[PDB]
């Protein structure tokens, strides 16, 4: 109700300024539904889907690489995304071998900074394989 | 001596109605904090409270029902 | 706070990787849109 | 007797309130009496 | 009907032998050097004070810091005389309830007479908490004064009651080993319960933080 | 007899662990104190066990004497 | 002997009001962390607070009427 | 006196359902504050809260089953 | 034997003040977790704990006054 | 006089299992809020609730076995 | 018979601390989490737990004072 | 009178050992809400649970010797 | 005659510890969710686990103080 669902990207503007009902936000500390008087929170996002709910028959499916919420004082949530990619342009065959690749390179990290980074890489690669 | 066993079974059985009175403070406490996230309240947010409130009191009355059987 | 914290990394470092990890997973029909971003254009020269 | 002048500057500073064992002493005397009283009546 | 526990009935005796030797003895465990560099066994006693003198100093931050050089002597005495008694046949003076009623009351009443010699009005006008509503003045100042005089009894009885409670489970779990001339498999498990319980009974150091600290809060609040 | 018991602690303390006299405890007589247990309390180098654990072994056997009258238990024989 | 069983069960029943003392604590406790996020207080926060208060009472008061029923 | 031992036991064993009465009051105090983040309701959010109820009240109901054997 | 029931009756009747023991341990702990998220204590945040303290206290001293009035 | 002790003993020994259900509602009432934050169900989270029901019931069901040896 | 009913008279009133015996666990388990989120304990956020402890350990020894005054 | 007195002091003591089951409901249960925010699993996270699990059981197996202390 | 009253007055005194068997279950379950948010355990967060433990066991063991005095 009375909610301007803003959502975009640097390449192409997605669902923008339209009164859409419910948005899924993929976020560290989990996913939380936006229900029409949602409490304002400036939390940034983790990799995952956004399944956005409108009255137009059925829901759409997208995928955010690394986004940010700024839901304001009134009923206006603005979502951003670096890569709000569509799912169907993804190739499963090369995507699986990446997950076993980085775990095979975990113990080749002689420093402490990159050892978190390969833990980032498998988490981003685990994010897509449950999705697909 | 025959009257004295009536009242211990009256006094000790009525004790258990305290527990379910503690439970409906939780579910009505939790509806206050669930609403403060997502004002979709008149939908199944509030309706799950009256789901839960009737189900906990049904246990506490089930405790209190033996107080009228064992006394009589 | 997570494992990238207390390790020396940040959020912009987090966003560069899980962009590329998505963008390398694409089919070989939309490869040029991964080249549409192409962050390797700006150079850095220091004063010293 | 040099267990005094090492800590004599400390004493009249805080024994103005700290050396009120009178209450403690009063309680102790009473405590001894009640014990004696109950053993007197056995 | 496999493993039958046993018990032994025997009186558990907190006797009273010659105490004024036993009190003085954990003073001579700590020496004091008149030298610049010390001798690597006082030097880890001297470091251990530096730590916990920097936590009963930080809260107060007044000219009530003069009092705090005593409060670290209060922590070493019942820090030691609760830790000596874990030995085979030793005797703790903080077992008996006598001296703890002489550790609470000359210290607790040293606090309420500290502000009454300087402030004289607002020390026990701390009984006034807030911007006074009408229906609960008499329900308040009969409550917040009955929870003031509890404090000396609340301070001493919490120390004597759990220190001795450690010593009985030392005996009773220990004495059930000796009287376990039935099946010998369960003897080890009661022994393994003991050597866990003796690790928990080095919370006799942990119960001296909860004696100096609620003496600070009962000093910081009044002053 | 006061200078007799006072010269027991002073002499013993210097000899047992630490004090041209301060570094005499830097090597320490802990190597002399070591051989009583078996070998195992080896950590006495700067937290000195054998310096402290002798007093606490003395205070136990001193308190075994007072308890001896009460917990007699002995038959007309010896134990195993 | 008749007074022996009466005077225990009247005390044995009024332990049932202890459980109401527990459940009444959360209802003014969760509303503290419920209102702390969302200052929309004059709306249905407090109206869900008073309903939660007077419903846990009725599992404590209902034993108390039964508690005086034992004495008479 | 032999019949008196029947009466004294079940009123004591009655109270073992008091905590299991409040033990179902909190599993509904979660699903209020659980659903109000993530509207995935008809899926395994609600299907798990069904299982937590019938398991816990059964352990309360077996406490009432021993109340009958003391009664009979 | 009449005074013998006067003593054991107030023995369990003051267990009802323990319900105001654990029920007050929450509502003073909920003003910890819900203060840091929103520093507005001089507004109705502290005032809804004093209502939450006193009206939770009123069921504490009421089950104390039973133990006086059962005995005298 | 032996019969008057066996029946009050086991019914007293049944009281504690109310403590078990009042915690066992929490171990699924934390998994409702657990899965609703991060859908990690099929991994280690749900198996902890399988351990969580199995553990605290072992604190509970042994107390029932205490009641049997008083009865037998 | 005056002595014996006193012996069980203080035995039932011992458990009045059992409310404060765990009500002090909650409020000192709610400043572990209110200092974790926002490190500002040195202000109100510690003095609201001791003030939580004073007004909740006022009721632990409050009942054992009655169990003494029924004994002697 | 001898076996009458012993057993109802033994069963009424074993109620307290399921009084610590409601704590490990929180100890084993609140691992769930911690594990979902952060998966640093084999860190002190699961090991702090063992410091909770065996210390709360250490008040559970506390009173069980005291019950068998009054069996004999 | 009071030989049983020696027992049950001790046998009822022991179940007042059953609060603090759960009250430390809070403060260790409530620490891991204060820790998984903010991994700074060597700071004052763990120091509030033990003072919360010690202040709860201070109200824990001295309920068994009144147990032995009724015995001895």
UniProtKB/Swiss-Prot annotation, chain E:
The identity of this protein, by name, is ATP synthase F(0) complex subunit a
- Subcellular localization(s) per the UniProt record: Mitochondrion inner membrane
Q: Which reaction does it catalyse?
A: H(+)(in) = H(+)(out)
What does the UniProt function comment say about this protein? Subunit a, of the mitochondrial membrane ATP synthase complex (F(1)F(0) ATP synthase or Complex V) that produces ATP from ADP in the presence of a proton gradient across the membrane which is generated by electron transport complexes of the respiratory chain. ATP synthase complex consist of a soluble F(1) head domain - the catalytic core - and a membrane F(1) domain - the membrane proton channel. These two domains are linked by a central stalk rotating inside the F(1) region and a stationary peripheral stalk.
- Identify the species of origin: Sus scrofa (Pig)
Q: Which family does the record claim for this protein? A: Belongs to the ATPase A chain family.
* Gene Ontology cellular component terms for the protein in this record: mitochondrial inner membrane; proton-transporting ATP synthase complex
According to the record's subunit comment, the protein's assembly and interactions are:
Component of the ATP synthase complex composed at least of ATP5F1A/subunit alpha, ATP5F1B/subunit beta, ATP5MC1/subunit c (homooctomer), MT-ATP6/subunit a, MT-ATP8/subunit 8, ATP5ME/subunit e, ATP5MF/subunit f, ATP5MG/subunit g, ATP5MK/subunit k, ATP5MJ/subunit j, ATP5F1C/subunit gamma, ATP5F1D/subunit delta, ATP5F1E/subunit epsilon, ATP5PF/subunit F6, ATP5PB/subunit b, ATP5PD/subunit d, ATP5PO/subunit OSCP.
Pfam families linked to this entry: ATP-synt_A
* Tagged with keyword Transport: yes
- What are the disulfide bonds? none
Q: Describe its membrane topology.
A: Multi-pass membrane protein
Q: Name one GO molecular function term.
A: proton channel activity
From Swiss-Prot, chain F:
Per the annotation, which location comes first and is thus the protein's main one? mitochondrion
Task: Tell me the keywords, alphabetical order.
Answer: Acetylation, ATP synthesis, CF(0), Hydrogen ion transport, Ion transport, Membrane, Mitochondrion, Mitochondrion inner membrane, Phosphoprotein, Transmembrane, Transmembrane helix, Transport
Q: Which processes are annotated in GO (biological process)?
A: ATP biosynthetic process; proton transmembrane transport
Q: Which residues cross the membrane?
A: 54-71
Tell me which residues bear Phosphoserine: 2
Report membrane topology: Single-pass membrane protein
Residues annotated as carrying N-acetylalanine in the record are 1
User: GO CC terms on record?
Assistant: mitochondrial inner membrane; proton-transporting ATP synthase complex
Q: Does the keyword Transmembrane helix apply?
A: yes
Its quaternary organisation is:
Component of the ATP synthase complex composed at least of ATP5F1A/subunit alpha, ATP5F1B/subunit beta, ATP5MC1/subunit c (homooctomer), MT-ATP6/subunit a, MT-ATP8/subunit 8, ATP5ME/subunit e, ATP5MF/subunit f, ATP5MG/subunit g, ATP5MK/subunit k, ATP5MJ/subunit j, ATP5F1C/subunit gamma, ATP5F1D/subunit delta, ATP5F1E/subunit epsilon, ATP5PF/subunit F6, ATP5PB/subunit b, ATP5PD/subunit d, ATP5PO/subunit OSCP.
Q: Which family does it belong to?
A: Belongs to the ATPase F chain family.
- Protein function: Subunit f, of the mitochondrial membrane ATP synthase complex (F(1)F(0) ATP synthase or Complex V) that produces ATP from ADP in the presence of a proton gradient across the membrane which is generated by electron transport complexes of the respiratory chain. ATP synthase complex consist of a soluble F(1) head domain - the catalytic core - and a membrane F(1) domain - the membrane proton channel. These two domains are linked by a central stalk rotating inside the F(1) region and a stationary peripheral stalk.
Q: What is this protein called?
A: ATP synthase F(0) complex subunit f, mitochondrial
